[PDB]
Design a protein around this ligand. Structure first.
Ligand SMILES: CCCCCCCCCCCCCCCCCCCC(=O)O
Length: 120
């Protein structure tokens, strides 16, 4: 089974991803206020955290059932699934960091509240 991620899963994954990727504190500050510059440093951050939460695979791409579970807590599956899938695309520029980001970007645009609430 896949289980949901919380604030202190995120906290852990944030510090691990900052470490391995060597993310400037600069960038970390923006992430904490849900701001995301459109460059590789931010893109690979998102991939890393998604990898650790089991929401994205570098080969397979977005993991749809897990994304819906994460967001829905297995409650409002069908509605959330429809919104999640609108943001699912293929690895068009063979850049896994970009792929994960572009998904996250699509979904944060309209549904950022749900993302924050999925952690809470
Ligand atoms: C389906 C496309 C993805 C939409 C986001 C799904 C949300 C579930 C994942 C849990 C939260 C991580 C979202 C990425 C935010 C970046 C991490 C740092 C955020 C922060 O500092 O609070």
């Amino acid at each position: 089974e896949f289980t949901v991620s919380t604030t202190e899963d995120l906290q852990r994954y944030r510090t691990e991803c900052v470490s391995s990727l060597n993310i400037p504190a600069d960038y970390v500050e923006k992430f904490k206020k849900w701001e995301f510059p459109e460059d590789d440093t931010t893109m690979c951050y998102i991939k890393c955290v998604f990898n650790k939460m089991q929401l994205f695979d570098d080969t397979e791409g977005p993991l749809v059932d897990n994304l819906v579970h994460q967001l829905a807590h297995g409650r409002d599956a069908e509605e959330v699934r429809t919104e999640v899938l609108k943001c699912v695309d293929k690895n068009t520029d063979n850049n896994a960091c970009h792929w994960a980001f572009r998904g996250f970007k699509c979904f944060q645009k309209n549904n950022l509240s749900l993302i924050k609430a999925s952690i809470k």
